[PDB]
Amino acid sequence: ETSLVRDLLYVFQGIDGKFVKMCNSENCYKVDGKVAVSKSLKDITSKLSELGWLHNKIKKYTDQRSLDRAFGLVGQSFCAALHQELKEYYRLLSVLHSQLQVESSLTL
Amino acid sequence: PNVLLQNLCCRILGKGEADVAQQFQYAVRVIGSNFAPTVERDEFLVTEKIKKEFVRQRREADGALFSELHRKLQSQGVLKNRWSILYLLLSLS
Amino acid sequence: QKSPNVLLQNLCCRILGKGEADVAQQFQYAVRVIGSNFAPTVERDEFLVTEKIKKEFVRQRREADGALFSELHRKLQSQGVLKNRWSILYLLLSLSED
Amino acid sequence: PNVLLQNLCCRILGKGEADVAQQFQYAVRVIGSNFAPTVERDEFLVTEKIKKEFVRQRREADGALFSELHRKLQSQGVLKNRWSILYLLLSLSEDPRKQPNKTSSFAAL
Amino acid sequence: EPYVTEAGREAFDKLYKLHEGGLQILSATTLQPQLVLLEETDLVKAVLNVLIGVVSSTFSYNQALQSFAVKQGVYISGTSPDNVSSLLTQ
Amino acid sequence: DARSWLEQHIVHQYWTSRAPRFSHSSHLHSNLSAIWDQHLYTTDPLYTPDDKTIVTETQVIRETLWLLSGVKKLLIFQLNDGKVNVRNDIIVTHMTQNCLRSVLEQIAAYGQVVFRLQKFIDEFRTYQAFMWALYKYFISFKEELTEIEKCIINKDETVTLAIVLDKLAPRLAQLKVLHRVFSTGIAEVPPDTRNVVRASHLLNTLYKAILDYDNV
Amino acid sequence: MIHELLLALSGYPGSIFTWNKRTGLQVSQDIPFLHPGETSVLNRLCKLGTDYIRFTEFIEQYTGLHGIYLRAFCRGLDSILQPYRQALLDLEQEFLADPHLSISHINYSLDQFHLLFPSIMVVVEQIKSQKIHGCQILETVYKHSCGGLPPVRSALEKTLAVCHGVMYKQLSAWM
Amino acid sequence: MIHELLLALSGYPGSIFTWNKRTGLQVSQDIPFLHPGETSVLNRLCKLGTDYIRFTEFIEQYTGLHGIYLRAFCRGLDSI
Amino acid sequence: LYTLFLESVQSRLQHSESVTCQSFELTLRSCLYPHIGKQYLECCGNL
Amino acid sequence: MSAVRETMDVLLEISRLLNTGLDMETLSICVRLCEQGINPEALSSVIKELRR
Amino acid sequence: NMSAVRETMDVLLEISRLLNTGLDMETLSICVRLCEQGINPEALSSVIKELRRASDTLK
Amino acid sequence: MSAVRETMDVLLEISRLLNTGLDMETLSICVRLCEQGINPEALSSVIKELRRASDTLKA
């Protein structure tokens, strides 16, 4: 329960945490490996998977951005511009993780 | 209760203790008829409203900061009727 | 985990051949013994102890065993995960037999 | 003797002025068992044990110094209680090589 | 916290009293020497008098040497540790 | 009682164990050494739990600040003049013993040099006036010593590893460049003939150094 | 978590932060209490301290092959690491102001420096795998500051400016 | 410490600052509740008040061999 | 000659930032080489 | 007490951001009332009339 | 880490067999840990020896 | 009392060279004990037992 709640924070950052997902490149779908979990709160983490899936595609364009300074002048200055709004994504994530540690609700 | 209510009239009007009488009766009546909250208690609704307001004025940077600061208010663990205070600030913008 | 007492209980249990509580009395005895004041005999030289062990092998005519041990000492030192080698060498010294 | 032996029990532990009761009563019992020594007096013989010990631990320089200090000691004032003092320092003599195992992990047993 | 160096005078005073005590046990006399209050500003007035050749309550004039005599003990000696006991004599 | 007053108003002892020792803090990030040490005691069945002198935050750092412009300290197991090395049991509350050593050895070397530079101070004139230029420069490093000494004695002291060691951080580099000039200067001083060559090849490393540094 | 990583970012090694000097870096996370998700991102911040200690080694080696413009670019480049290091102690107080922050705060502050740090480290490595020295370091960094990324192109004009200033000294005396 | 270190500096014996005639004035070794580390520098601070009363003795012997220039050297050094 | 040197160094630095001087210490020696001259030409006059 | 200061600081900063026209003393008073379970609606209503 | 404990266990195990002993490796592994937890070599020897005295009598 | 101060400075040199590990205050207690008469064996025996005891109590 609370463990899926830490684990969606790791998938908003787009880098697989607690469980193996076997996905990062057609969604990000969590696998708990049980039938006893409901699929009414694993359907919610398939909406939280598609926010993290579409995240890693902006990060990986910026990983192809690292060049000595080859092709384009505008070509890495564009991806520069996509790194600013990406920084802000990370700012809405820093208030979420702070909700998790014991100090309204922590629900999904 | 009474002393605090009076001190408020005194402070905002910048006038002394027995010079606030007429307003003092108005506040006691308005407060007396609607003393307690009539709406559910739910911190989340207010934080969303405060954040839509910032969105509405495209003062998004002050909005982002406001979330950090609200989290800080919660984490300290000192207040209990956080919602009401935030709703009072929001009403006064 | 690896506290002095736990480590001693494991010794008693397996050696006597019985359960944890059947070796309970010898466990009490053991603790009394360890907690006896003993003053270090080794406050110097890893070398001098190694020499005594080598002397034990020669003394029993187990020369081949001393030839191999000498090489093995050099290895023991080299991996060096033991920071109280000397103590171990003394323990082994007292357990020397034919 | 009681105020002196006691104050030793407080200082050694560095703490406790009645929490050192156990150690006091114990010190008193120990002192109350009658030891007899191997050699009583002679300044030269105790001084010699300290010189040989010096050589043995590889603190040869210091051993050289100790002799100057010994002579000095007589001149600042003559002792009648020296053998016993010089012994006490002897029994507390240590080697500059090696540690005595752990004695801060030994408490847990 | 502070160590003695930073800790002003008091810490040093408590230390001096403890240290002297340590030595004081082997020496046996009728009564052990103890402090008798003067303040540091009261010492500078007893010395103002001894320059003209008048006694205070730390000086006892001796006709036998035609000289003055200060307290020899652990008599308060400022906050110095029995240093004024030798310095004030000069 | 003089002893109970001394125990309260001066920091608990670290050269002796007679007065125990601050080893708590209330966050969950500052007990790091105990958890890390625990993790190892669960993880390696061969672990020696190292015996460690507890500090007592920002008192090992004032004693490194002593060293850096003054005398040797016996909470540092230094040996000879060319070896000034770190005691093998000092820890700070909220850092790993391995991690902490790694820094104590940085600033160990920057006090290694200051102890060497002091070892040249003894009580021709060219060679005396070069030694006195080193020492005239020292009163401006001891001038800083009392600056940083007043920040840490104050309550709340609000100094630590990362904001104490930035104030002396340009002077730390100015003493590093004292070292190369003087290490390559003297080398004919222990073999025979001082006569002209001690003065001349010590003017020469000085002259190379003002050409190397000023003109770049 | 936080204070060992703040100072492994300044380039002082842990043993839960293994660094084996100039052949590589191993991240060294076998840590129970830090989650497999919070340690995975912690490796992403670690790569940015690997490139930070591959850069300071080039400082201390050439201020202390031959050329006055190797060490003039060394006093240009420290000025650019001056807000990097400035940010390292402002974070020290960030974890003292409240203790309700974790490493998500460290991911957020360090992306601004993430667009500086491989991109300048590749510039000096390209200088040094060709073994470029003299006035043509300045032409090398000029054809890099002709490049893109809006922070880096302003930064390398500052690193160009202190050792072009050393150029300016020769031809002022020469004239 | 503060007035107490001025009067060890004049060279005059203290209790904490023992005089041993072999060495001049020196701080006594390893005094509890003071770390040993601060006394080493303190020994050096005593070394300027030790040589200073090794100095007044060079004065007072010839003031208050023989030589009219001995006591002229006393009035040379007093301004130092 | 030592005092004269400091004064000719001091007045160039104060007349701050050293950037009016270039480059930099050998310029200060080549002011001192005329300080030697005024003694070297004037000793040779009495000869 | 320490905690309470820090809390008043957050509250003052939030107030500034929301440009409400409350200072420290009026806000402390407002907080003490709210904490007693006062209806914020009614309270805002009084405060606006008091500012007029 | 798993390799390191094992290599160590092995060098000791060759040496033990050479001086002869009825002991298994597992008890020998404990002894290293007891030494590593400190403890004077005479206390360690006495307890080991004593256990062996007790075993032999018992069976 | 003048006498009492001189002896302790020379005495502290031997004890620190020889490794004994007694501070000033304690070194004064033993000198008292030896002057009032004590068997030397007892005095060494207690000091060693108190020391061993103290380190364990603390830890």
Side-chain angles (χ1 to χ4, degrees), chain C residues 67-79:
Chain C
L68 301 168
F69 169 56
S70 302
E71 295 174 80
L72 285 156
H73 182 40
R74 311 319 315 197
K75 278 74 182 175
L76 186 63
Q77 291 176 278
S78 188
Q79 315 312 277

PDB file of all heavy atoms in Angstrom, chain C residues 67-79:
ATOM      1  N   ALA C  67      57.189 -27.081   6.555  1.00  0.00           N
ATOM      2  CA  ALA C  67      57.593 -26.605   5.282  1.00  0.00           C
ATOM      3  C   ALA C  67      56.378 -25.969   4.590  1.00  0.00           C
ATOM      4  O   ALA C  67      56.469 -24.848   4.117  1.00  0.00           O
ATOM      5  CB  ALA C  67      58.154 -27.759   4.390  1.00  0.00           C
ATOM      6  N   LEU C  68      55.205 -26.672   4.610  1.00  0.00           N
ATOM      7  CA  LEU C  68      53.917 -26.167   4.041  1.00  0.00           C
ATOM      8  C   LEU C  68      53.364 -25.034   4.827  1.00  0.00           C
ATOM      9  O   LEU C  68      52.857 -24.091   4.164  1.00  0.00           O
ATOM     10  CB  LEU C  68      52.874 -27.287   3.831  1.00  0.00           C
ATOM     11  CG  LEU C  68      53.389 -28.428   2.856  1.00  0.00           C
ATOM     12  CD1 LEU C  68      52.434 -29.623   2.927  1.00  0.00           C
ATOM     13  CD2 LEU C  68      53.646 -28.060   1.380  1.00  0.00           C
ATOM     14  N   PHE C  69      53.295 -25.098   6.191  1.00  0.00           N
ATOM     15  CA  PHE C  69      52.860 -24.052   7.045  1.00  0.00           C
ATOM     16  C   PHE C  69      53.588 -22.810   6.806  1.00  0.00           C
ATOM     17  O   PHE C  69      52.960 -21.782   6.829  1.00  0.00           O
ATOM     18  CB  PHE C  69      53.064 -24.474   8.545  1.00  0.00           C
ATOM     19  CG  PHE C  69      52.894 -23.354   9.508  1.00  0.00           C
ATOM     20  CD1 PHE C  69      51.671 -22.663   9.472  1.00  0.00           C
ATOM     21  CD2 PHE C  69      53.961 -22.847  10.340  1.00  0.00           C
ATOM     22  CE1 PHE C  69      51.482 -21.475  10.177  1.00  0.00           C
ATOM     23  CE2 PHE C  69      53.768 -21.675  11.038  1.00  0.00           C
ATOM     24  CZ  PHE C  69      52.522 -20.932  10.962  1.00  0.00           C
ATOM     25  N   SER C  70      54.900 -22.805   6.602  1.00  0.00           N
ATOM     26  CA  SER C  70      55.632 -21.571   6.390  1.00  0.00           C
ATOM     27  C   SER C  70      55.181 -20.820   5.199  1.00  0.00           C
ATOM     28  O   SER C  70      54.926 -19.613   5.288  1.00  0.00           O
ATOM     29  CB  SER C  70      57.232 -21.827   6.200  1.00  0.00           C
ATOM     30  OG  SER C  70      57.757 -22.508   7.341  1.00  0.00           O
ATOM     31  N   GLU C  71      54.966 -21.550   4.090  1.00  0.00           N
ATOM     32  CA  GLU C  71      54.419 -20.938   2.947  1.00  0.00           C
ATOM     33  C   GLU C  71      52.963 -20.377   3.227  1.00  0.00           C
ATOM     34  O   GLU C  71      52.663 -19.261   2.778  1.00  0.00           O
ATOM     35  CB  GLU C  71      54.269 -21.987   1.796  1.00  0.00           C
ATOM     36  CG  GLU C  71      55.654 -22.503   1.345  1.00  0.00           C
ATOM     37  CD  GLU C  71      55.560 -23.660   0.308  1.00  0.00           C
ATOM     38  OE1 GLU C  71      55.328 -23.451  -0.957  1.00  0.00           O
ATOM     39  OE2 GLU C  71      55.580 -24.849   0.704  1.00  0.00           O
ATOM     40  N   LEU C  72      52.147 -21.154   3.916  1.00  0.00           N
ATOM     41  CA  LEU C  72      50.775 -20.839   4.247  1.00  0.00           C
ATOM     42  C   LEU C  72      50.678 -19.594   5.143  1.00  0.00           C
ATOM     43  O   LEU C  72      49.726 -18.809   5.014  1.00  0.00           O
ATOM     44  CB  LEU C  72      49.930 -21.919   4.977  1.00  0.00           C
ATOM     45  CG  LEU C  72      49.480 -23.101   4.037  1.00  0.00           C
ATOM     46  CD1 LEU C  72      49.218 -24.334   4.944  1.00  0.00           C
ATOM     47  CD2 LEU C  72      48.199 -22.765   3.179  1.00  0.00           C
ATOM     48  N   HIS C  73      51.591 -19.316   6.057  1.00  0.00           N
ATOM     49  CA  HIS C  73      51.700 -18.133   6.943  1.00  0.00           C
ATOM     50  C   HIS C  73      51.687 -16.856   6.110  1.00  0.00           C
ATOM     51  O   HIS C  73      51.026 -15.883   6.496  1.00  0.00           O
ATOM     52  CB  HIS C  73      52.869 -18.135   8.001  1.00  0.00           C
ATOM     53  CG  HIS C  73      52.867 -16.907   8.896  1.00  0.00           C
ATOM     54  ND1 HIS C  73      51.732 -16.283   9.444  1.00  0.00           N
ATOM     55  CD2 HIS C  73      53.860 -16.085   9.169  1.00  0.00           C
ATOM     56  CE1 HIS C  73      52.195 -15.147  10.007  1.00  0.00           C
ATOM     57  NE2 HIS C  73      53.473 -15.033   9.887  1.00  0.00           N
ATOM     58  N   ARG C  74      52.436 -16.887   5.008  1.00  0.00           N
ATOM     59  CA  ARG C  74      52.768 -15.808   4.129  1.00  0.00           C
ATOM     60  C   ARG C  74      51.553 -15.275   3.338  1.00  0.00           C
ATOM     61  O   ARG C  74      51.210 -14.075   3.291  1.00  0.00           O
ATOM     62  CB  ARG C  74      53.856 -16.085   3.148  1.00  0.00           C
ATOM     63  CG  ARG C  74      55.108 -16.716   3.779  1.00  0.00           C
ATOM     64  CD  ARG C  74      55.676 -16.283   5.120  1.00  0.00           C
ATOM     65  NE  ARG C  74      55.688 -14.817   5.162  1.00  0.00           N
ATOM     66  CZ  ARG C  74      56.399 -14.076   6.036  1.00  0.00           C
ATOM     67  NH1 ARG C  74      57.092 -14.578   7.098  1.00  0.00           N
ATOM     68  NH2 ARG C  74      56.290 -12.782   5.916  1.00  0.00           N
ATOM     69  N   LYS C  75      50.765 -16.285   2.832  1.00  0.00           N
ATOM     70  CA  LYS C  75      49.372 -16.216   2.346  1.00  0.00           C
ATOM     71  C   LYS C  75      48.412 -15.640   3.381  1.00  0.00           C
ATOM     72  O   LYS C  75      47.576 -14.839   3.070  1.00  0.00           O
ATOM     73  CB  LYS C  75      48.852 -17.568   1.761  1.00  0.00           C
ATOM     74  CG  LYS C  75      49.260 -17.893   0.284  1.00  0.00           C
ATOM     75  CD  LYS C  75      50.692 -18.298   0.193  1.00  0.00           C
ATOM     76  CE  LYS C  75      50.927 -18.516  -1.307  1.00  0.00           C
ATOM     77  NZ  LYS C  75      52.368 -18.826  -1.759  1.00  0.00           N
ATOM     78  N   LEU C  76      48.385 -16.112   4.688  1.00  0.00           N
ATOM     79  CA  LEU C  76      47.506 -15.745   5.724  1.00  0.00           C
ATOM     80  C   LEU C  76      47.607 -14.267   6.026  1.00  0.00           C
ATOM     81  O   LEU C  76      46.603 -13.523   6.203  1.00  0.00           O
ATOM     82  CB  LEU C  76      47.735 -16.682   6.928  1.00  0.00           C
ATOM     83  CG  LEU C  76      46.749 -16.542   8.135  1.00  0.00           C
ATOM     84  CD1 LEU C  76      45.309 -16.876   7.793  1.00  0.00           C
ATOM     85  CD2 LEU C  76      47.281 -17.271   9.464  1.00  0.00           C
ATOM     86  N   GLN C  77      48.862 -13.797   5.973  1.00  0.00           N
ATOM     87  CA  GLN C  77      49.237 -12.388   6.208  1.00  0.00           C
ATOM     88  C   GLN C  77      48.794 -11.467   5.133  1.00  0.00           C
ATOM     89  O   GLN C  77      48.423 -10.361   5.513  1.00  0.00           O
ATOM     90  CB  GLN C  77      50.733 -12.139   6.393  1.00  0.00           C
ATOM     91  CG  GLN C  77      51.312 -12.713   7.713  1.00  0.00           C
ATOM     92  CD  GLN C  77      52.896 -12.430   7.620  1.00  0.00           C
ATOM     93  OE1 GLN C  77      53.541 -13.279   6.934  1.00  0.00           O
ATOM     94  NE2 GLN C  77      53.404 -11.339   8.309  1.00  0.00           N
ATOM     95  N   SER C  78      48.939 -11.953   3.886  1.00  0.00           N
ATOM     96  CA  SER C  78      48.772 -11.262   2.657  1.00  0.00           C
ATOM     97  C   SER C  78      47.356 -10.902   2.344  1.00  0.00           C
ATOM     98  O   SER C  78      47.064  -9.830   1.872  1.00  0.00           O
ATOM     99  CB  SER C  78      49.307 -12.199   1.484  1.00  0.00           C
ATOM    100  OG  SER C  78      49.385 -11.608   0.200  1.00  0.00           O
ATOM    101  N   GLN C  79      46.396 -11.853   2.729  1.00  0.00           N
ATOM    102  CA  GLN C  79      45.051 -11.514   2.498  1.00  0.00           C
ATOM    103  C   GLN C  79      44.612 -10.542   3.624  1.00  0.00           C
ATOM    104  O   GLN C  79      43.882  -9.614   3.327  1.00  0.00           O
ATOM    105  CB  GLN C  79      44.082 -12.754   2.598  1.00  0.00           C
ATOM    106  CG  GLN C  79      44.519 -14.078   1.891  1.00  0.00           C
ATOM    107  CD  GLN C  79      44.974 -13.763   0.447  1.00  0.00           C
ATOM    108  OE1 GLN C  79      44.060 -13.667  -0.415  1.00  0.00           O
ATOM    109  NE2 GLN C  79      46.287 -13.593   0.058  1.00  0.00           N
TER     110      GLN C  79
END
